[PDB]
Design a protein around this ligand. Sequence first.
Ligand SMILES: [Zn+2]
Length: 46
Amino acid sequence: GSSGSSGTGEKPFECAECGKSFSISSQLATHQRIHTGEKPSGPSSG
Ligand SMILES: [Zn+2]
C-alpha cells in the first residue's frame, strides 16, 4: 500500500538555487542572474 498523490505545478525551467520556476528560458535566465556571481568552483560549467 503505497499512497501519495499530489502536485505543486511543475515546470521544465526550475531553479535549484532558491526555489523558483518559469515557463521559458529567457525568464529563467533573467533570474539566474541574481544567482550568478559567487565562486562555487574554479572554471565554468561550459
Ligand atoms: Zn532562484
